[PDB]
Paper text:
Work describing the contribution of bacteriophages to the emergence and diversification of the M1T1 GAS clone revealed that each prophage contains a conserved open reading frame (ORF) of ~60aa named paratox (prx). prx is always located adjacent to a toxin within the prophage, and GAS prophages that lack a toxin also lack prx. In our efforts to study the regulation of natural competence in Streptococcus spp. by ComRS based quorum sensing, we discovered that prx genes contain a perfect CIN-box within their promoter region for recognition by the SigX core-RNA-polymerase complex, and that transcription of prx is induced by XIP. Additionally, we found that Prx binds ComR directly and inhibits activation by XIP both in vitro and in vivo. Taken together we conclude that the conserved prophage protein paratox acts as an inhibitor of new DNA acquisition by pyogenic, bovis and suis streptococci.
Additionally, an X-ray crystal structure of Prx reveals a novel protein fold with only distant structural homologues, which suggests a unique molecular mechanism of ComR-XIP inhibition. Prx crystallized as a dimer in the asymmetric unit. The dimer interface consists of residues from β-strands β1, β3 and the loop region between β2 and β3, which allows the N and C terminal α-helices to be positioned on the same face of the complex. As calculated by MOLEonline/2.531, the pore or cavity sizes are 380Å3 and 993Å3. Although analysis by SEC indicates a possible dimer, analysis with PISA32 gives a complex significance score of 0.1, which suggests a high probability that dimerization is a crystal packing artifact. As demonstrated by analytical ultracentrifugation (AUC), Prx is a monomer (8.39 kDa) in the buffer conditions used in our biochemical experiments. A surface composed of one face of α1 (D5, L8, and E9) and α2 (M55, V46) also cluster into a conserved patch, and both surfaces tend toward an electronegative electrostatic potential.
Residue numbers in the entry: 1 to 68
The structure:
Amino acid sequence: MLYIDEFKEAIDKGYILGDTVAIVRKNGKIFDYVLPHEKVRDDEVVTVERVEEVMVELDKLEHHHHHH
């Protein structure tokens, strides 16, 4: 699974430019981003997604515990 830190860094460093991005999902979960010209295998499903929507989906894997 892809996590938010890597995704945000790829945006900050200019690998993921713009408002939509190619994504591969497995079982509905995001497993990687795919950059222009990168190759995928036949069993991979590549969709174009909103960068903001990806950021919400990746938040589902973050820790939110806020009691101490």
